[PDB]
Design an enzyme around this catalytic site. Structure first.
Site, mmCIF file in Angstrom:
data_model
loop_
_atom_site.group_PDB
_atom_site.id
_atom_site.type_symbol
_atom_site.label_atom_id
_atom_site.label_comp_id
_atom_site.label_asym_id
_atom_site.label_seq_id
_atom_site.Cartn_x
_atom_site.Cartn_y
_atom_site.Cartn_z
ATOM 1 N N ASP A 36 0.830 -1.200 0.000
ATOM 2 C CA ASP A 36 0.000 0.000 0.000
ATOM 3 C C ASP A 36 0.868 1.255 0.000
ATOM 4 O O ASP A 36 1.347 1.671 1.057
ATOM 5 C CB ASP A 36 -0.896 -0.028 1.232
ATOM 6 C CG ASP A 36 -1.813 1.180 1.317
ATOM 7 O OD1 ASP A 36 -1.932 1.896 0.306
ATOM 8 O OD2 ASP A 36 -2.393 1.407 2.405
ATOM 9 N N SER B 26 -0.765 15.594 -11.952
ATOM 10 C CA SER B 26 -1.013 15.229 -13.335
ATOM 11 C C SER B 26 -1.277 16.489 -14.148
ATOM 12 O O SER B 26 -1.800 17.486 -13.643
ATOM 13 C CB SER B 26 -2.215 14.275 -13.408
ATOM 14 O OG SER B 26 -2.602 14.058 -14.739
#
Length: 330
Positions: A35, A199
């Site tokens: 994770d 992004s």
């Protein structure tokens, strides 16, 4: 040193991925959920409340000659999905894919919430976010990657998750045969403890690319792709019959649909998520309403590039002094 381990979807939907991890002496092998969105290595154990164990493999520290109680240390964690666990701490030898750390904090669960009990395939979590998020008290502990970093050939790990197929986590090296083209690296902020990046935009299907900054985290422990409501609405508007359902808890779409791809920007580069990756199947057995793999982050407080996004790429978690993230197509 290096390590290399195969990671395998837990079910036919890729709801999560499990990677075998050797703990203790002699080795006890548990299948852990790696994770990058948390920083605790915790396991179902001989100390876990018996009614809360249902098929998981447990770590028994009393059977490990290298286990040592970390005196006074406790841990307690809550995840974004509402699940939680807590317990005490041992140090022991932990190996992943041939890479060994001695003295790793292994957090032994005394309690786990229902969703962990109900998932017999996940024996615990291995956190790969920054150690500043580790919950051990009163002495915060380091992640497996942090403890191994100095010994690694290069201070990196890579995630190469499969679509409906096994993939690979590598530590200490970049397998140049595992991706196509070049790796595009992008800046990371560690201010929230996550692999947080920005992004450069998105496209829906064959549509034109929208340049817009989307701050989010690269999170292997989250199944889906969680993005701003504007972006998610633009995606699902291209699927006839798709709608957001408060009762289901997100966007659903007709199972008869063919989904468009979703592209996200990494600098000047582009990662394309095929439409099929966005299909999470019937909302309930036999339903013709299917659950979408792109969902709104509006209720989270952060955008999450989870498995739906990450599995479309070869992802480098670069833990150099200034961390960065790398993405390549594959």
């Amino acid at each position: 040193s290096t390590g290399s381990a195969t990671t395998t979807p837990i079910d036919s939907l890729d709801d999560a991925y499990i990677t075998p991890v050797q703990i203790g002496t002699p080795a006890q092998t548990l299948n852990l959920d790696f994770d990058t969105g948390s920083s605790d290595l915790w396991v179902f154990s001989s100390e876990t409340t018996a009614s809360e164990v249902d098929g998981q493999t447990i770590y028994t520290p009393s059977k490990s000659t290298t286990a040592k109680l970390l005196s006074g240390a406790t841990w307690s964690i809550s995840y974004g999905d509402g699940s939680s666990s807590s317990g005490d701490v041992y140090t022991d030898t932990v190996s992943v894919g041939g890479l060994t750390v001695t003295g790793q904090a292994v957090e032994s669960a005394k309690k786990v919430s229902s969703s962990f009990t109900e998932d017999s395939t996940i024996d615990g979590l291995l956190g790969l976010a920054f150690s500043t998020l580790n919950t051990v008290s009163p002495t915060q502990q380091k992640t497996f990657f942090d403890n191994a970093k100095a010994s690694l050939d290069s201070p990196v790990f890579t995630a190469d998750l499969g679509y409906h197929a096994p993939g690979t986590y590598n530590f200490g090296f970049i397998d140049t045969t595992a991706y196509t083209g070049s790796i595009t690296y992008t800046a990371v902020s560690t201010k929230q403890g996550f692999w947080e990046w920005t992004s450069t935009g998105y496209a829906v299907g064959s549509g034109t690319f929208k340049s817009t900054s989307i701050d989010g985290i690269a999170d292997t422990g989250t199944t889906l792709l969680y993005l701003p409501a504007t972006v998610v609405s633009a995606y699902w508007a291209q699927v006839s019959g798709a709608k957001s359902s408060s009762s289901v808890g997100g966007y659903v779409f007709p199972c008869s649909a063919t989904l468009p791809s979703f592209t996200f920007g990494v600098g000047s580069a582009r990662i394309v998520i095929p439409g099929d990756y966005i299909d999470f199947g019937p909302i309930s057995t036999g339903s013709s309403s299917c659950f979408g793999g792109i969902q709104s982050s509006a209720g989270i407080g952060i955008n999450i590039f989870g498995d739906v996004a990450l599995k479309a790429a070869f992802v480098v978690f670069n833990g150099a002094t200034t961390p960065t993230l790398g993405f390549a197509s594959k």
